[PDB]
Scaffold this active site. Sequence first.
Site, PDB file in Angstrom:
ATOM      1  N   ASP A 189     -34.013 -27.910 -56.627  1.00  0.00           N
ATOM      2  CA  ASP A 189     -33.382 -27.507 -57.896  1.00  0.00           C
ATOM      3  C   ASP A 189     -34.345 -27.440 -59.066  1.00  0.00           C
ATOM      4  O   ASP A 189     -34.656 -28.449 -59.659  1.00  0.00           O
ATOM      5  CB  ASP A 189     -32.299 -28.510 -58.250  1.00  0.00           C
ATOM      6  CG  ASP A 189     -31.515 -28.098 -59.460  1.00  0.00           C
ATOM      7  OD1 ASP A 189     -31.799 -27.017 -60.026  1.00  0.00           O
ATOM      8  OD2 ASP A 189     -30.617 -28.864 -59.825  1.00  0.00           O
TER       9      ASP A 189
ATOM     10  N   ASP B  72     -33.228 -21.124 -62.449  1.00  0.00           N
ATOM     11  CA  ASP B  72     -32.444 -22.210 -61.846  1.00  0.00           C
ATOM     12  C   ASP B  72     -32.050 -21.961 -60.387  1.00  0.00           C
ATOM     13  O   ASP B  72     -31.125 -21.184 -60.090  1.00  0.00           O
ATOM     14  CB  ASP B  72     -31.163 -22.410 -62.677  1.00  0.00           C
ATOM     15  CG  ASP B  72     -30.356 -23.606 -62.230  1.00  0.00           C
ATOM     16  OD1 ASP B  72     -30.905 -24.465 -61.512  1.00  0.00           O
ATOM     17  OD2 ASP B  72     -29.166 -23.687 -62.605  1.00  0.00           O
TER      18      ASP B  72
HETATM   19  N1  LIG Z   1     -29.501 -26.657 -61.664  1.00  0.00           N
HETATM   20  C1  LIG Z   1     -28.353 -27.434 -61.740  1.00  0.00           C
HETATM   21  N2  LIG Z   1     -28.330 -28.633 -61.157  1.00  0.00           N
HETATM   22  C2  LIG Z   1     -27.263 -29.427 -61.205  1.00  0.00           C
HETATM   23  C3  LIG Z   1     -26.111 -29.028 -61.866  1.00  0.00           C
HETATM   24  C4  LIG Z   1     -26.088 -27.781 -62.489  1.00  0.00           C
HETATM   25  C5  LIG Z   1     -27.218 -26.952 -62.428  1.00  0.00           C
HETATM   26  N3  LIG Z   1     -27.240 -25.693 -63.066  1.00  0.00           N
HETATM   27  C6  LIG Z   1     -26.169 -25.300 -63.987  1.00  0.00           C
HETATM   28  C7  LIG Z   1     -26.217 -26.022 -65.323  1.00  0.00           C
HETATM   29  C8  LIG Z   1     -27.431 -26.110 -65.989  1.00  0.00           C
HETATM   30  C9  LIG Z   1     -27.508 -26.750 -67.230  1.00  0.00           C
HETATM   31  C10 LIG Z   1     -28.817 -26.860 -67.906  1.00  0.00           C
HETATM   32  C11 LIG Z   1     -28.922 -26.778 -69.310  1.00  0.00           C
HETATM   33  C12 LIG Z   1     -30.146 -26.929 -69.910  1.00  0.00           C
HETATM   34  C13 LIG Z   1     -31.292 -27.168 -69.119  1.00  0.00           C
HETATM   35  C14 LIG Z   1     -32.708 -27.367 -69.409  1.00  0.00           C
HETATM   36  C15 LIG Z   1     -33.348 -27.574 -68.243  1.00  0.00           C
HETATM   37  N4  LIG Z   1     -32.476 -27.520 -67.205  1.00  0.00           N
HETATM   38  C16 LIG Z   1     -31.190 -27.283 -67.702  1.00  0.00           C
HETATM   39  C17 LIG Z   1     -29.927 -27.135 -67.112  1.00  0.00           C
HETATM   40  C18 LIG Z   1     -26.354 -27.327 -67.813  1.00  0.00           C
HETATM   41  C19 LIG Z   1     -25.136 -27.251 -67.146  1.00  0.00           C
HETATM   42  C20 LIG Z   1     -25.058 -26.600 -65.901  1.00  0.00           C
HETATM   43  O1  LIG Z   1     -23.847 -26.533 -65.263  1.00  0.00           O
HETATM   44  C21 LIG Z   1     -23.120 -25.407 -65.770  1.00  0.00           C
HETATM   45  C22 LIG Z   1     -23.288 -24.244 -64.822  1.00  0.00           C
HETATM   46  C23 LIG Z   1     -22.621 -24.251 -63.591  1.00  0.00           C
HETATM   47  C24 LIG Z   1     -22.776 -23.172 -62.711  1.00  0.00           C
HETATM   48  C25 LIG Z   1     -23.596 -22.124 -63.135  1.00  0.00           C
HETATM   49  C26 LIG Z   1     -24.241 -22.175 -64.368  1.00  0.00           C
HETATM   50  N5  LIG Z   1     -24.077 -23.225 -65.163  1.00  0.00           N
END
Ligand SMILES: Nc1ncccc1NCc1cc(-c2ccc3cc[nH]c3c2)ccc1OCc1ccccn1
Length: 377
Positions: free
Chosen positions: A220, A34
Amino acid sequence: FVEMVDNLRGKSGQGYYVEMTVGSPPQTLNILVDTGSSNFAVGAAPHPFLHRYYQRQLSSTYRDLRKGVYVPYTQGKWEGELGTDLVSIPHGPNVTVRANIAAITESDKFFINGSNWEGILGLAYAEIARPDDSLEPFFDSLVKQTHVPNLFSLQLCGAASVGGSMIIGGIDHSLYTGSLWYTPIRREWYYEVIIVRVEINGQDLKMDCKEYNYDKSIVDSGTTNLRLPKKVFEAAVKSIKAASSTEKFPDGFWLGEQLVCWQAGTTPWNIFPVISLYLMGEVTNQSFRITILPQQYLRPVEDVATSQDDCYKFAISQSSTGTVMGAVIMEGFYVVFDRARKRIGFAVSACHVHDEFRTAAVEGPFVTLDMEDCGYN
Ligand SMILES: Nc1ncccc1NCc1cc(-c2ccc3cc[nH]c3c2)ccc1OCc1ccccn1
């Protein structure tokens, strides 16, 4: 870099993951790649969706930081306990680093039922790390503690199972054709870039370019879709809708509320237009463009339990958070996250999915004035 080729797996719409090892002795986990976040966070408890999870009790090199993290989002959340431990990437560089790990101990609508990953590797910058920017991101730790050069690259192939390559510390020329073109990383928080112009089938949207980057444009790998600001989205779809008059579809489809279907092998690609995004170049008044096909933005949903033919979803959607260049964009291109030089390069992917008639392209240079006015402050 041949050891790293093909080190990424996945299922459509469920992201791309890489094998990683944590702790001593090493515990193998599959970790979502990610570029839109900056935490390294792993399932650390037997959630029923998980194939495997981090067992801190089995690791001699584990160290508790005795601090928690609570990570809410609109539809869900995860939370966890901060620590550090030794981290390695089997099909990555031959090194071991001490990284931060958020051990995930409770979550809501985070993990996917039926998926084969158990954690997330946030490759973006400390500014957006949680709980704050003091939590050194994995890649920062990797670069600080090794001689691994400060860049990585991604070839996301998307074919059911998708595959790809994450080349850590460099660039593999077999992964692309033609030339790399670079756009500046505007600010090191997300991988933020500036889109200076948008065309559909060569005809441009004639929109104040600041709308293209309200309030962000980012690259992203954690998002499936091309996401466009509302005002750009309605404009984009309006034009996509017109370019595609030959046939008719419900308004819900363009809102990803419904899917559209054709008979097997009968999808009319050519009724759908190419989409071009022009990105700010490395030089004053110089831009380039990337062009994607409908094969990129009409993504196949064979997933439908209540059907048996070629059905696709419209993979472009509105956003309140800015432009998101997700897998819809990234699957056309080899993408170079050149952190050393604060820039992202795009080239045509040796693996992207095209027809005999049209192709994904990266082209420049173009002359575009007032490119910094396109940025939102
Ligand atoms: N890459 C991204 N883009 C926008 C918002 C958030 C993001 N990454 C974090 C994320 C990813 C998923 C997610 C879940 C499943 C899948 C399957 C494919 N892509 C995803 C993303 C779910 C929630 C989410 O936010 C929580 C978070 C915040 C900061 C750090 C880590 N996490």
